[model samples]
Target: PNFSGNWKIIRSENFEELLKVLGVNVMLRKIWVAAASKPAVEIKQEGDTFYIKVSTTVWTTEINFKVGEEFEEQTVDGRPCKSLVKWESENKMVCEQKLLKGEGPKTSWTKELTNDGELILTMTADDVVCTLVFVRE
Candidate 1:
């Protein structure tokens, strides 16, 4: 997919649960779940490379990765990991993240562009699943 535009988070499900599964602390969770903040997403792609940017009231993260290549990445909460991005279809991509420290299941995050003009971001780890939907900005 030609994911080269700004996207804004419109809806989310099981987000806090997924964060807990990823070892996020209670305080951070409370801060994240506070009603005062809104999350934003921006995706930029060039040929085989992609830039994923997520912004919130508390923090912002930018990830750079190339398809079919393994690279180092850090989670929004600062956990380091080995990451790989791959294309599942023309309109979909999947990211595999292997944590390099502590204990937790590996995370698989998929970004799919829906026909309805929504960007569906699904993050999964073990039994935890978080789905965040975004619209073009």
Candidate 2:
């Protein structure tokens, strides 16, 4: 089935390390610690487009994009990036983000749902990787 549901993030790996590697400043890192680890995740999909919402006590944000479209976005921490999205399979979605204005790190992100219904997010920036696991709420 497609990824269209409300989910709760149960665990995260290397969450802080990714911030360090990405050069997010101390103030933003404080914000990200609360934002990125937010438990609520909701995704609404229509055709080739998806709207993803992350809700938290501190902040809530939405990012929407259509598959195969290259777009520009400013991250919650104010980092600007160009993003491209693709699907690897019915259960997997991939995104590549080129960050900053020049000579910055590139990130590859993959989100996949297991047959057991657990959703996994693999976030990669340069050589750093962070994984977060989710379960339907």
Candidate 3:
């Protein structure tokens, strides 16, 4: 789906467990958890390029990338990786990040729109997966 609008997070599943599985820092884990409860992601897609903004409690992270292009990204946990975005279908897109900072599980995420028009983002690291639901605002 074209995630070209303001989306407000409605719900999330297994987020804290996933963080524990990933061994996120204790301090930041709570911070991230607080932010997730009121998360907002603004996406602006232009052709094959996308400009996305993710907000935390204070700072906002902006990332821009072209579809099908492998780009460098630093994970929230401070791991350096190469990420690639690809379309699986008209309304579904998947992105995989290969960690080079160190070896770990393959990180992958999928963004798609459901038949009912709700936006869903699913993130997976190894077997632990966290899914979040969003509604257009």
Candidate 4:
């Protein structure tokens, strides 16, 4: 499925559950929630390959991936990382990122396709992946 559209974070009832998993402290969470800037993701796809650009007020992140291909990703969210990305199934993209010198914790990114063909980018990092679920826009 092509991940080309506009989206917004209308609400986040269970977003905190993932924040807890990312190791964010309670105080940090409170502050973050107050000033949370919902980022937008634009995915450009060609065949089985995709190029993603994630944009936010603080910073912008971009990545290019192909099915079953492993690529070294630049440091993101303040950690030097490497990842292998692939399509687990139709409309579902998967990635495993090795971060922090590859000695500390690792993170996971799962993108699921919606009925309307929208993509939900979900990142999991030790329970504190700082606002993981992003809608495709």
Q: Pick the candidate with the highest lDDT.
A: 1
lDDT tens digits by residue: candidate 2, 53-135: 88777677778888899887654345788888898988898998877586656677888999998989888877988998999
Q: List clashing residue pairs in candidate 2.
A: none
Model 3, span 60-100: residue lDDT tens: 77777898999887564557888898989888888889887
Per-candidate clashes, comma-separated: 0, 0, 1, 8
User: Against the unseen true structure, what C-alpha lDDT does each candidate score?
Assistant: 0.82, 0.80, 0.80, 0.64
lDDT of 4 by residue, 33-132 (tens): 6655466667677887778776677877778877787776654344667788777887777888876374554577777777764456666666544334
Work out the TM-score per prediction: 0.88, 0.84, 0.87, 0.73
lDDT of 3 at 8: 88
Q: Model 1, 81: alpha-carbon shift in Å?
A: 0.2
* Full candidate order by TM-score, most accurate first: 1, 3, 2, 4
Candidate 1, pairs of clashing residues: none
**Whole-model lDDT, model 3:** 0.80
Query: Residue 133 lDDT in model 4?
Result: 44
Q: Please report how far candidate 3 places residue 95 from its true position, in Å.
A: 0.9
User: With candidate 2 superimposed using the best TM-score fit, by how many Å does residue 8's alpha carbon deviate from the native?
Assistant: 0.5
Against the true structure, candidate 2 reaches a TM-score of 0.84
Q: Once model 2 is optimally superposed onto the true structure by TM-score, how far is the C-alpha of residue 101 displaced, in angstroms?
A: 2.3
CA RMSD of all predictions: 1.9, 2.5, 2.0, 3.3
Off by over 4 Å in 2: 25-36, 75-77, 100-102
